[PDB]
Every structure is written in structure tokens, then in C-alpha cells.
């Protein structure tokens, strides 16, 4: 998550209808990667820059991290 627009659906219970199931509300939402570029975060300047500059990827090809430099993030051990 990175906004209220995508958050909203789960915050509602509407996401779950797309999967042929009744509405399933969440009691809130959680933010991690998003806040990294907050000016009151210690994330270095050019770092925060390079963070934004990562072109995200949809839930579609998220698993592609395991094999490729998908978006701006890769997976590593």
C-alpha cells in the first residue's frame, strides 16, 4: 500500500468481491515502504530519491522479484 485509494478497498471489504467472495472488512491498514521518503525519516537524500524513482509493479508480476530486477526491487538472500 501507498495511498488511501488502494487502501480503501481492503479497509472496506470490497477487494474480496472480485474473488467471488462476500465483503471482508479490514480493521485498518499498515504502511512501511511508503513512509521511507518522509522528510522526518533518516533515509539519505539520494536514497529517498532512488526510492521514488523505483517504478513499482502491480500485484500481477510481484513474484518476478525472485528472478529479475522487477520494477526497482530485486530479492536477495
Amino acid at each position: 500500500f501507498g495511498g488511501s485509494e488502494d487502501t480503501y478497498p481492503y479497509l472496506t471489504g470490497s477487494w474480496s468481491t472480485k474473488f467471488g467472495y462476500p465483503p471482508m472488512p479490514f480493521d485498518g491498514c499498515m504502511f512501511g515502504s511508503r513512509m521511507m521518503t518522509a522528510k522526518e525519516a533518516h533515509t539519505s537524500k539520494q536514497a529517498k530519491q532512488a526510492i521514488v524513482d523505483a517504478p513499482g509493479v502491480d500485484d500481477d508480476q510481484w513474484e518476478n522479484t525472485y528472478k529479475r530486477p522487477t520494477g526497482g526491487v530485486i530479492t536477495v538472500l
Partner: protein, 76 residues
């Protein structure tokens, strides 16, 4: 089961819950005119049901954490 068709107490009737009814988001306002997206989380914690999760590098320093709680939000 069977006995739920033949009962005389007033409390004898059950309603299967719709999580939309029971856990659906809501809005509410304070005696000083704040607005809170009403959920189990926000009502528990006592703040907006939007929360910054704890993250080692960035969520470590006492600034970002206390500054984010001064901004009225739940952080780890």
C-alpha cells in the same frame, strides 16, 4: 440444531453476522470536532486506523517515531 426451532426464551434467536455490518468502517466525531475513521483498531489504539509499521533502518531512530506520534499516528 433442532432446539433452535422450538424455544421460548426471548434470547433464543441467532443471527449469522455480516462482517460488513459488524466490522464495516465508520466515521465519528469528538466533543472537540475531530473525525476518526471508526474501526476496531483505531478505537483500540485511540488514533487513525492508518499505521506506520516498524522497520529496522528507518523506524529505529527516536525522531521519526516520536515525530510520527506527535503527528497523531500509531508507529512501531
Amino acid at each position: 440444531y433442532k432446539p433452535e426451532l422450538f424455544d421460548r426464551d426471548d434470547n433464543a434467536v441467532q443471527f449469522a453476522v455480516d462482517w460488513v455490518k459488524e466490522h464495516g468502517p465508520r466515521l465519528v466525531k469528538t466533543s472537540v470536532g475531530q473525525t476518526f475513521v471508526d474501526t476496531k483498531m483505531s478505537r483500540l489504539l485511540g488514533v487513525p486506523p492508518v499505521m506506520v509499521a516498524g522497520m529496522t533502518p528507518t523506524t529505529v531512530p527516536w525522531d521519526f517515531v516520536a515525530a510520527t506520534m506527535n503527528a497523531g499516528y500509531h508507529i512501531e
